[PDB]
Amino acid sequence: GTSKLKYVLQDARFFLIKSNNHENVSLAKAKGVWSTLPVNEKKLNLAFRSARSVILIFSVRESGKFQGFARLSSESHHGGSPIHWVLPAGMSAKMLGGVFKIDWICRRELPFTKSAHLTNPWNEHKPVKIGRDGQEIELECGTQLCLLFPPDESIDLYQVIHKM
Ligand SMILES: CNc1ncnc2c1ncn2C
Structure with a gap:
């Protein structure tokens, strides 16, 4: 089912x-x-x-x-055991030093071809696939985008709901 997922995305x-x-x-x-x-x-x-x-x-x-897609479970935190990110050019380890803990909600992929009907009002109504890193996605678009993903039956959202 999808009811707990909808509850998390509320x-x-x-x-x-x-x-x-x-x-x-x-x-x-x-x-x-x-x-x-x-x-x-x-x-x-x-x-x-x-x-x-x-x-x-x-x-x-x-x-x-x-x-x-995944849900933040903490604020960022610096200085722990370093994450061995593959660093993009011009991006240093210090620039990426803030670590957020996340709980995955879906680890399955979704092709851009399946989201062509969703546009993001916070990015000039462009298709939601378009956007720079960190672009916020409006609530209705974001909800619908997440609901398009294939179910990830390996996930139990019971713990995530407890964190809310
Ligand atoms: C681990 N963070 C990242 N990794 C690779 N690329 C990134 C990242 N953040 C922003 N961009 C463009």
């Missing part, structure tokens, strides 16, 4: 994550963490305080797909 905020490589999304799925540039770090920390759920929706650049 009045959530949604942010588009654009990764320059597959390796870091695979690491994020394995280790339950994400890091972003300081300008986005600040926005996510603020939104983590503001809403029942903050949802990250991941797309690897040039893949033509989303790779899944």
Whole structure:
């Protein structure tokens, strides 16, 4: 079913994550963490305080797909055991030093061809696949985008609901 998923997405905020490589999304799925540039770090920390759920929706650049979506379970935190991110050019380890814990809600992919009917009012009504890393996605668009993903039957949202 989809009722707990809908409950998690109730009045959530949604942010588009654009990764320059597959390796870091695979690491994020394995280790339950994400890091972003300081300008986005600040926005996510603020939104983590503001809403029942903050949802990250991941797309690897040039893949033509989303790779899944996850819910922030913490604010960012610096200085722990370093995450072995593959660093994009011009991106240093210090720039990505803030670590967010995340709980994955869906690790299945969705091709851009299936979201062509969803546009994001916070990005000039462009198709929701279009956007820079950290672009916020409006509530209705974000909800519908998440509901388009194939079910991930490996996930139990019972614990995530307890964190809300
Ligand atoms: C682990 N964070 C990241 N990895 C790869 N690329 C990124 C990232 N953040 C923003 N961009 C463009």
